Design an enzyme around this catalytic site. Structure first.
Site, PDB file in Angstrom:
ATOM      1  N   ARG D 339      20.142  -2.739  -1.694  1.00  0.00           N
ATOM      2  CA  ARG D 339      19.761  -1.508  -2.528  1.00  0.00           C
ATOM      3  C   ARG D 339      20.887  -0.364  -2.932  1.00  0.00           C
ATOM      4  O   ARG D 339      20.685   0.396  -3.593  1.00  0.00           O
ATOM      5  CB  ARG D 339      18.620  -0.873  -1.726  1.00  0.00           C
TER       6      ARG D 339
HETATM    7  N1  LIG Z   1      12.497  -3.421 -12.028  1.00  0.00           N
HETATM    8  C1  LIG Z   1      13.399  -3.768 -11.014  1.00  0.00           C
HETATM    9  N2  LIG Z   1      14.478  -4.701 -11.765  1.00  0.00           N
HETATM   10  C2  LIG Z   1      15.348  -5.005 -10.760  1.00  0.00           C
HETATM   11  N3  LIG Z   1      15.551  -5.024  -9.364  1.00  0.00           N
HETATM   12  C3  LIG Z   1      14.347  -4.432  -9.007  1.00  0.00           C
HETATM   13  C4  LIG Z   1      13.262  -3.917  -9.695  1.00  0.00           C
HETATM   14  N4  LIG Z   1      12.445  -3.401  -8.815  1.00  0.00           N
HETATM   15  C5  LIG Z   1      12.800  -3.560  -7.572  1.00  0.00           C
HETATM   16  N5  LIG Z   1      13.915  -4.237  -7.495  1.00  0.00           N
HETATM   17  C6  LIG Z   1      14.769  -4.645  -6.458  1.00  0.00           C
HETATM   18  O1  LIG Z   1      13.923  -4.944  -5.311  1.00  0.00           O
HETATM   19  C7  LIG Z   1      14.202  -3.953  -4.387  1.00  0.00           C
HETATM   20  C8  LIG Z   1      13.240  -2.789  -4.309  1.00  0.00           C
HETATM   21  O2  LIG Z   1      13.708  -1.652  -3.635  1.00  0.00           O
HETATM   22  P1  LIG Z   1      12.749  -0.667  -3.386  1.00  0.00           P
HETATM   23  O3  LIG Z   1      13.517   0.705  -2.998  1.00  0.00           O
HETATM   24  O4  LIG Z   1      11.742  -0.544  -4.483  1.00  0.00           O
HETATM   25  O5  LIG Z   1      11.981  -0.915  -2.049  1.00  0.00           O
HETATM   26  P2  LIG Z   1      10.530  -0.468  -1.561  1.00  0.00           P
HETATM   27  O6  LIG Z   1       9.578  -1.401  -1.856  1.00  0.00           O
HETATM   28  O7  LIG Z   1      10.494   0.829  -2.240  1.00  0.00           O
HETATM   29  O8  LIG Z   1      10.742  -0.491  -0.034  1.00  0.00           O
HETATM   30  P3  LIG Z   1      10.015   0.947   0.918  1.00  0.00           P
HETATM   31  O9  LIG Z   1       8.364   0.471   0.925  1.00  0.00           O
HETATM   32  O10 LIG Z   1      10.066   0.680   2.242  1.00  0.00           O
HETATM   33  O11 LIG Z   1       9.952   2.280   0.168  1.00  0.00           O
HETATM   34  C9  LIG Z   1      15.541  -3.668  -4.657  1.00  0.00           C
HETATM   35  O12 LIG Z   1      16.333  -4.696  -4.107  1.00  0.00           O
HETATM   36  C10 LIG Z   1      15.723  -3.466  -5.796  1.00  0.00           C
HETATM   37  O13 LIG Z   1      17.006  -3.808  -6.405  1.00  0.00           O
END
Ligand SMILES: Nc1ncnc2c1ncn2[C@@H]1O[C@H](COP(=O)(O)OP(=O)(O)OP(=O)(O)O)[C@@H](O)[C@H]1O
Ligand SMILES: Nc1ncnc2c1ncn2[C@@H]1O[C@H](COP(=O)(O)OP(=O)(O)OP(=O)(O)O)[C@@H](O)[C@H]1O
Ligand SMILES: Nc1ncnc2c1ncn2[C@@H]1O[C@H](COP(=O)(O)OP(=O)(O)OP(=O)(O)O)[C@@H](O)[C@H]1O
Ligand SMILES: [Mg+2]
Ligand SMILES: [Mg+2]
Ligand SMILES: [Mg+2]
Lengths: 56, 476, 471, 475, 121
Positions: D339
């Site tokens: 991330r």
């Molecule tokens: N639209 C997108 N395009 C590219 N990569 C994405 C996209 N959405 C998410 N990702 C990737 O998937 C992951 C998403 O990270 P994110 O911070 O959203 O986790 P999260 O689901 O919010 O975790 P938590 O539930 O603990 O908050 C990262 O690796 C990010 O690079």
């Protein structure tokens, strides 16, 4: 035509036999996951019974 | 004596000392001014579930004993309003002159007092009115996953009752209060809200008000049945009532059971669901049909609340999410839905056509379950697969557009007698649309005979009518 | 005598013993000021929230900061009121802890500011409104299958690592620039890294002037995590009532409010439920969620995320909160692993705004017909695993054909993605979305290779990619 | 201020007395083993006992240290092997640290931190290309038994050399043979010069299993607050969770999911967010932490994997299926993400290493669909050939760290397709002979990348590829 | 119902049928009473004393020297899986069992009893 119809019944026999093998393998994997899911549910239920029994 | 001191105030519950002459289910009033329902009469302290906001109460406060027992206001005045289970208006429009009160808990009618269920409750929903019939006095569960169609089917029921006399009721338990407002405005827009009462307990409300909501709703319904008018009660989710009981009982320190539901649950629901009746001519000829709903988690079954309610109710409708997202609406599985009363309730014309339709759809349900995967089958099976596919497409319907029974029997008759073979599966929802217009442009005498006689018209003239329409309709 | 004494400690929970006749009400707040009197002790300033009475003048309380150091017989004062948040015009551009003290280095709030209770009853049935219209937001799937609602609750449901915060950041990048209304962003169960990254994002775009912010973090004790959600909401409430502007509220992760309740409930002393949760799950979660309402006085739109405790939705905390949300987005791990982003479940996304009245007939027919093709594709996936693709025919061949392309074309390059990947982002109008999915369902572009449809904005961009790959 | 023990409950104990104690205070018995006061009920104190508990008997005497969980830290500690109480176990000698830090520290606030500015160079091709790390990031390494987790941890710590990059390895619930074998592998490579090692082993009671990560970060906080870099490895956190479950149920606390209490999220979160990248106003230090978790039959959907995956800033998933199919090591592209990507990498890498992971993920799903049926030529050609060449490029052998300049050249040749004409086993011979060729013929490019930190000028980068066509074999 | 049928056998000495409409509800009423009494569940939540109570009932149905009390009982099988404790505990006591399947009832052939799955001594 005789060889064609005989070889068709051979081709269907082998294709249906292989398809049965694929169906059997899939049923095995699904049964393993179903057993794991049921045993997980039962062990959670037993954990709730213990948590109730000490809490009261 | 009968004034007591509070010695806990946690969590929406209290405990109290004194109150020697207390009774189970009595009302007791706090110094703050809200009142509570005494529910465990233990050895030295009375348990006291609290109605209304509990934040003001502190230990050392005094409870007085009201001496009354739980009662609901009833009258003709309530019809057309939105009201709280304790009986207060919450809608604006001012106070309601309720002439008298009925108890919340009282004995149901005995075995002798009832009669057999012989008159229908037409809903306008083709797949129910044909394949899972309801008769007045019947109790029937609708159980399905979330976002499948529980409230839309309820509202289609309340909307169709304009044409036949029914003092319908609708009870909302735990709901988001803006969804209740969207429902009420939908009943107003379809011109249907003036003969019905809506009872609301929203999600914000303290636990006992969710719990007591169906008991007060039925207490409102039965007065009209004692007068002799037909009644309908809908409970929008019984499972949320059961959960309010669980949380209330766990806070009271009662021995738990499966899941954690207290062991009383089946009795509590049977006390609710066995007041529904069809009283005899000596008692007035009334009715109180009930439609409870249960939301199952992920297609769960054999769980505690669903098996309890499925054992109590005289039928059950099961809705399938994977059917809904496949285009069948309202999605209803004929395979797992049963009505023990069925056959008797239907009109005689319907009894002839709906009985054969059940046979047809059961036979194709099994043949399609296995033989659809292979491309080509036996001719006779390709025919039965065609008839089943047309059957399910002809049973698809729109939203908030009830169809009167007169034009249901004429479409099901057209289906079973095999007039729809020429027409393609995609065009059917248009064959219906263009046909019902034709049936109001021509054939009024057919409908009139069915309206009062309850009888299928002469088969020569019915075939003449359908053949003329099949001259008019244009195939894609 | 209004000063008390701690009698027991048990982690987050503390038990005070006030003298008779001065017991605080539930939800009041209490202060700890203790001189470090001897070379052994540790000085602390801590505040406690009352959560139950327990008889014989005892009250059970949740500490708002770590209890390391407390002693039997140490004093506790009473504030007399709920945790009091300073609100008004001066809040905008500031960042607060849960207690209402600023942490942003800029300064401290004037003492003359009106400060307000966090606990108050929800709005009633006569006050609500239901005039419902699209919060058009440019995220291709949400603009098609589950259109979000202006003035309505919106929900993001997903497991850890699926892509909820990236979606919230794309929503802030698209909406919060043009909304023209106060935005409140509250961090509940929030990574401190994302908090810093957001504060710099808001300064770099200048957006920080209109908005205000409250934070709690994963490293905070559970009481702080619970009462951050309520402190954030009280701000949004004042602006929509008194100022009458439309307001936008974001809560970073509302599951951690219920989980923190699960931690502190067993110590409070009340029996488990269906999987260890407290008894009062649905009543207290409903109490919070029923305050977040668009009355006639002025609308709130609120966008929330909920972490499903595992990849299991049948869990109590997701189950109780699926009812309250007008439009819900389900993010599923299995799609994300295929590389489709955002990983949105086409079949399980539900919103009230889908209705021929609200979206119009052209848009409705397309939402349902697309869900119909993907549901048939799930059915075909099993039988092709047994017999193969070679055995399907006619309507089953073309469903697998079109369901692959549709499943890829619901993926889009976010404008916030440019840090995770080199790509430029896009904004797609609703009309281009509804025409695009119509064109895929008609089959006009069926010849283009299925590789091309991934991470793309409009059908013209797909034609350009397919041309570079030799079409 | 004296109290006596009144139960001895298999490592838990309880005491009557201790009138002025405070939660977290250390009490040390007449035995001389340390005790940590957790709870204070109205009549008694709950004392978790650290160390050999079998010598404790009811009516023993409890005395107070006066301090809250103080673990000794100083420069004297570097190099040695100690237990989590900070006592040496290597037998070299005493440890002469002057002062102590708390085990309990409030993490740095939102205003204290900064974006992750600089890489931490592992030298492992698949990590540095697909899933890069930067200083102050926290990243989970997760996999089943015998999949190479410690080989990656020790590769990373050994690759850090010329930097003042202080490092720590914490063994939690680990067999003494394995800890001793590496304390000798780190001595062999000389990397033991600057690192500290902390060991708690399976024979030790659970109180000393669950605290060990807190001592690892408490040692790291001295260096990070002073201003230097740090790196922490915890050798397994899943044993910390198991030790907490075992202690919690020896207390009378009610279980939850899979018998774990809900407190398991707060424990790990109170552990991991002390890792940081402080800002200039605070002193610019850093504390990247690499925790490890063990999956059982690859169940990344279980409770503790997802619990920890919510807290960490990425994950690396190490796959058995590829590993025992000969791909030592392999990373599952679709399950492993960072991330903090882009920010941590050097600029040249951003120009070369951007989209490669989503290219692998697309290749994995195409391989699945390719089993069932026929395919289109431009999809078969592009995504399967490049996907296989990507996994064959990124496989790497034991203890051979590769400098970033040479990774950048091979990643450039992969993403721009300059090697696509060379297949299969010839590709790993190609990339070996490529490094062996450029070692003496790449000086201009290599110093250009070292100083400018940018992709060299494409005409001379192409000069490298041009010369390698002449140097490389026919096959 | 048992105590009434027992008078007719013991004094009148003639075959006296006892019908019970569904005993599944009877087992569940016992489970709920045990939970109200504060005992600990087992299996799918049925009380500890499942076989004991059901045996106590079923064993009085007999053919002693005076005559008979032959009984015909019906059972609800919750979800077409017969391994649930109430059917499984019942199955040993019964001398002859006929299985009713919904597919035949919906086929409109009655009383719906499966020829292949029905067994008797
Ligand atoms: N639209 C997108 N395009 C590219 N990569 C994405 C996209 N959405 C998410 N990702 C990737 O998937 C992951 C998403 O990270 P994110 O911070 O959203 O986790 P999260 O689901 O919010 O975790 P938590 O539930 O603990 O908050 C990262 O690796 C990010 O690079
Ligand atoms: N007959 C129907 N045809 C088409 N869509 C329908 C039909 N009945 C309901 N729907 C659709 O159902 C969705 C909402 O279902 P509904 O309002 O009944 O909620 P529900 O399924 O009862 O769940 P809940 O009980 O939580 O309200 C809307 O998309 C609505 O258009
Ligand atoms: N890249 C590699 N090349 C060659 N051999 C390797 C590589 N990685 C691991 N091995 C060998 O396989 C062994 C197993 O990996 P490792 O010892 O790291 O197991 P692990 O997954 O850490 O299990 P544990 O946590 O129990 O140590 C290594 O000790 C080493 O002998
Ligand atoms: Mg509903
Ligand atoms: Mg996040
Ligand atoms: Mg190892």
């Amino acid at each position: 035509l005789l060889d064609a119809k005989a070889s068709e019944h051979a081709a269907r026999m082998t294709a249906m036999k292989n398809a049965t093998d694929n169906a059997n393998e899939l049923i095995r994997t699904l049964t393993l996951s179903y057993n794991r899911a049921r045993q997980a549910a039962i062990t959670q239920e037993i954990t709730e019974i213990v948590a109730g029994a000490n809490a009261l | 004596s009968d004034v007591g001191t509070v010695i806990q105030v946690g969590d929406g519950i209290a405990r109290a000392h004194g109150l020697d002459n207390v009774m189970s289910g009595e009302l007791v009033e706090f110094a703050n001014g809200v009142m509570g329902m005494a529910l465990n009469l233990e050895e030295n302290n009375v348990g006291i579930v609290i109605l209304g906001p509990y934040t003001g109460i502190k230990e050392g406060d005094e409870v007085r004993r009201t001496g009354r027992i739980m009662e609901v206001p009833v009258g003709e005045a309530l019809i057309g309003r939105v009201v709280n289970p304790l009986g207060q208006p919450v809608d604006g429009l001012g106070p309601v002159e309720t002439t008298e009160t009925r108890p919340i808990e009282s004995r149901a009618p005995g075995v002798m007092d009832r009669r057999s269920v012989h008159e229908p409750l037409q809903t306008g929903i083709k797949a129910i009115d044909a394949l899972v019939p309801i008769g007045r006095g019947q109790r029937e569960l609708i159980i399905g996953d979330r976002q499948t169609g529980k409230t839309s089917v309820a509202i289609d029921t309340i909307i169709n009752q304009k044409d036949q006399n029914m003092i319908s009721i609708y009870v909302a338990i735990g709901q988001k209060e803006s969804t209740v407002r969207t429902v009420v405005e939908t009943l107003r827009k379809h011109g249907a809200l003036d003969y019905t009462i809506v009872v609301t307990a929203s999600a914000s409300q303290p636990a006992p008000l969710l719990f007591l909501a169906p008991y007060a709703g039925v207490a409102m319904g039965e007065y009209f049945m004692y007068k002799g008018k037909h009644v309908l009660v809908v409970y929008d989710d019984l499972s949320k009532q059961a959960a309010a009981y669980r949380e209330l009982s766990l806070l009271l320190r009662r021995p738990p059971g499966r899941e954690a539901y207290p062991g009383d649950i089946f009795y509590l629901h049977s006390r609710l669901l066995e007041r529904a009746a069809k009283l005899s001519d000596a008692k007035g000829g009334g009715s109180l049909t009930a439609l409870p709903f249960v939301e199952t988690q992920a297609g769960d079954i054999s769980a505690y609340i669903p098996t309890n309610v499925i054992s109590i109710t005289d039928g059950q409708i099961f809705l399938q999410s994977d059917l809904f997202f496949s285009g069948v609406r309202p999605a209803i599985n004929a395979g797992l839905s049963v009505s023990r009363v069925g056959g008797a309730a239907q009109i005689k014309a319907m009894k002839k056509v709906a009985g054969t339709l059940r046979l047809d759809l059961a036979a194709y349900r099994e043949l399609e379950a296995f033989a659809q995967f292979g491309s080509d089958l036996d001719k006779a099976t390709q025919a039965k697969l065609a008839r089943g596919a047309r059957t399910v497409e002809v049973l698809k319907q729109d939203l908030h557009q009830p169809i009167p029974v007169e034009k249901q029997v004429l479409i099901i008759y057209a289906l079973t007698r095999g007039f729809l073979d020429d027409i393609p599966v995609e065009d059917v929802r248009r064959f219906e649309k263009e046909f019902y217009l034709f049936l109001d442009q021509n054939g009024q005498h057919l409908l009139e005979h069915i309206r009062t006689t309850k009888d299928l018209p002469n088969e020569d003239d019915l075939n003449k009518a359908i053949e003329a329409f099949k001259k008019t309709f244009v195939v894609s | 005598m209004t000063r008390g004494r701690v009698i027991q400690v048990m982690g987050p929970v503390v038990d005070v013993k006030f003298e008779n006749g001065h017991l605080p009400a539930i939800y009041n707040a209490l202060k700890i000021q203790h001189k470090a009197r001897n070379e052994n002790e540790v000085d602390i300033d801590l505040t406690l929230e009352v959560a139950l009475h327990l008889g014989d003048d005892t009250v059970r309380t949740i500490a708002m900061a770590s209890t390391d150091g407390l002693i039997r017989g140490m004093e506790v004062i009473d504030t007399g009121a709920p945790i009091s948040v300073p609100v008004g015009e001066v809040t905008l551009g500031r960042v607060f802890n849960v207690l209402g003290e600023p942490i942003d280095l800029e300064g401290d709030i004037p003492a003359d500011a009106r400060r307000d209770p966090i606990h108050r009853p929800a709005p009633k049935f006569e006050e609500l409104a239901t005039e419902v219209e699209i919060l058009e937001t440019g995220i291709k799937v949400v603009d098609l299958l589950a259109p979000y609602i202006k003035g309505g609750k919106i929900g993001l449901f997903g497991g850890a690592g699926v892509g909820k915060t990236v979606l919230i950041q794309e929503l802030i990048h698209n909406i919060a620039q043009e909304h023209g209304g106060i935005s409140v962003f509250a961090g509940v169960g929030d990574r401190t890294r994302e908090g810093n990254d957001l504060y710099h994002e808001m300064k770099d775009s200048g957006v920080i002037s209109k908005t205000a912010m409250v934070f709690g973090q994963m490293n905070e004790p559970p009481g702080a995590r619970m009462r951050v959600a309520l402190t954030g909401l009280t701000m949004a409430e004042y602006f929509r009532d008194e100022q009458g502007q439309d307001v936008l509220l974001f809560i970073d992760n509302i599951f951690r409010f219920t989980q923190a309740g699960s931690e502190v409930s067993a110590l409070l002393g009340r029996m488990p439920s269906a999987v260890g949760y407290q008894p009062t799950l649905a009543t207290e979660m409903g109490q919070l969620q029923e305050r977040i309402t668009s009355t006639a006085k002025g609308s709130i739109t609120s966008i929330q995320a909920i972490y499903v405790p595992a990849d299991d939705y049948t869990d109590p905390a997701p189950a109780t909160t699926f009812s309250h949300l007008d439009a819900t987005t389900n993010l599923e791990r299995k799609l994300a692993e295929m590389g489709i982003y955002p990983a949105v479940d086409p079949l399980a996304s539900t919103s009230r705004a889908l209705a021929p009245e609200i979206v119009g007939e052209e848009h409705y027919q397309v939402a349902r017909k697309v869900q119909q093709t993907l549901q048939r594709y799930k059915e075909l996936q099993d039988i092709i695993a047994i017999l193969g693709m070679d055995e399907l025919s006619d309507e089953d061949k073309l469903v697998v054909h079109r369901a692959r392309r549709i499943q890829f074309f619901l993926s889009q390059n976010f404008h916030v993605a440019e840090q995770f990947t080199g790509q430029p982002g896009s904004y797609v109008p609703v009309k281009e979305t509804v025409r695009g999915f119509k064109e895929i369902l008609e089959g006009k572009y069926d010849h283009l290779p299925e590789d091309a449809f991934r991470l793309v904005g409009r059908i013209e961009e797909v034609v350009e990619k397919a041309k570079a790959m030799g079409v």
